Amino acid sequence: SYRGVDLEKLLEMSTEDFVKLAPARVRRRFARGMTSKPAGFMKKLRAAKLAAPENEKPAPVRTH
Amino acid sequence: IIKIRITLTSTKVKQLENVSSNIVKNAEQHNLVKKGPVRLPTKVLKISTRKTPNGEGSKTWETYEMRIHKRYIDLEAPVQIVKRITQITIEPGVDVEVVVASN
Amino acid sequence: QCRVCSSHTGLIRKYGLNICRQCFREKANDIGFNKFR
Amino acid sequence: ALISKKRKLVADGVFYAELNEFFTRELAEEGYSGVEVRVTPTKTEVIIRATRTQDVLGENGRRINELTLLVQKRFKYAPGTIVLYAERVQDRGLSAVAQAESMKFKLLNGLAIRRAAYGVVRYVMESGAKGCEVVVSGKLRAARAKAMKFADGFLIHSGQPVNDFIDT
């Protein structure tokens, strides 16, 4: 509920208007650069995600 | 037969009045049109650096200097007159340039 | 760069020569710098 | 082209300040102390000055175009136009710049340093000097930093004579 919105806006709203409801730095840090190898957590976050009962553990990878 | 322009920007002031004299010498033995050697304001370089290799001691500094003098002459002559005389006024440390800018 | 004499800091970035200033006082002669005042 | 103006009068000095090193670090005999760069149109004529040009000439080009193949290739300079005109460098004690090289080597091949020292002096103070100056401050076979010394003269430095009497 940033803008008085539904606080359950979890899968329905994408990453793009996620930036729209946000302050200025990530409103610049959005087209800041198309990361590939620093976009390597997200290729491995989905490698272990949501395959569990209530309350999980992700697959963390050593990063910077 | 074209108006030309010569520049010379050196750093040995004794070895720039011999060159600028023999430039106007052999031109006036052939009596071309000319304008005198215009002498520009000189340029000085400087860098302050303190005087210790380590840092332990009292503090005041140095100041180094380097002086650049530059003067230039405009000229007009037939090309056969000038293309020989610009090759016999060489001297180390001295730079010579020819500009034929006639826009 | 670290040039020579225990220095990668205090480099003289001006005038495009890039010398460690510990190793400038002994090279400032033959470059053609001299002190006068 | 696209050439910065005052930098070309300071970059060549950096080029001056490093070429001399090999005439230090490679040779010892002939006396080629003072280098001299003479840039004519489209050729850089640094004058080779050697009293015994057989290290350089030898078998018609021992090191004429052998030393150039480093330095011209070092600065990405063009070949052929790297002219190194041969000459003879000046006399041993009977020159000005050679008094560096005169005493750059004349401490002994292994006997006492005083008999090294008292040799170097009597030559040129009568035969073409009233001031030169070398450096010695060292020990003699102990754990002391003792400092014995000598020189030959008072110099000539009276103002701007610091800056034409000091040299390369």
Add this chain to the structure above:
Amino acid sequence: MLMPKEDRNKIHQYLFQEGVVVAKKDFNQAKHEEIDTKNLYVIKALQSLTSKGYVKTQFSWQYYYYTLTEEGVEYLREYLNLPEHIVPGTYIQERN
């Protein structure tokens, strides 16, 4: 320090009419004209080659120098198995 031996033209070849190796204290860029390394190979390979002689090393503000001499006729003339009067180092060129 490995000596990878994939290419003698980029190991020791075309210096027979050069005789010199200019180099640089470097670190990882792997491209250099006129010499046999990319940017590391002959540098660590001359380390073996200096230790059999025939190349002399100055440093001189971090530019490695090398030049050949008499104890170099024993490999180049036979590894490239060529006759005389075309290889040599003391007569490196048409005049030197």
Add this chain to the structure above:
Amino acid sequence: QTAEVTIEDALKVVLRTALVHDGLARGLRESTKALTRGEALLVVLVSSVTEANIIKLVEGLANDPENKVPLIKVADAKQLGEWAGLGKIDREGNARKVVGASVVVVKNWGAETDELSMIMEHFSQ
């Protein structure tokens, strides 16, 4: 195809000139079926092997080889044991003679520049 007994001692050099060059293939896992990709090109073999497993599959086309690249066919089992680059090691004094390799695929020039042209008068005598 035939051979000789005198000039072949000067021709124990095709396999012998492979010593350090990091492109060498002295094996069975690459030096027997070296005619497949095109990068796999030829095999220099000898028919006096003690193991006739894979060579007799390739012996059907070895004596009638391809007409684009050399397929050197010899008879004696010495160069595979001595003149392969490791049997007789060209050493003065300290020489630990290890045994020669298997069938070795070689394709190199150098000392084998002119000797690929001198093998014309070898397979007929």
Add this chain to the structure above:
RNA sequence: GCUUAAUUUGACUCAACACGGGGAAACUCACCAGGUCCAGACACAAUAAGGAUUGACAGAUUGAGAGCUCUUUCUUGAUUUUG
């Protein structure tokens, strides 16, 4: 001084303390509890093809970043990994 997972230290009367040109994050790197791969001149040697390695993984592996694991087709090729 304290503190610390370490707060990297040099220098203590004028002649130490806005100074080591010390205005800041990853360059600096000297430090801390993770990660690396690079250790060979010659003279020693052995597996040097029936196998070291060059495998760099070759991508799912593999839990933890290209990975150091083989599940194998190897450029294999004694370079050198090695001792």
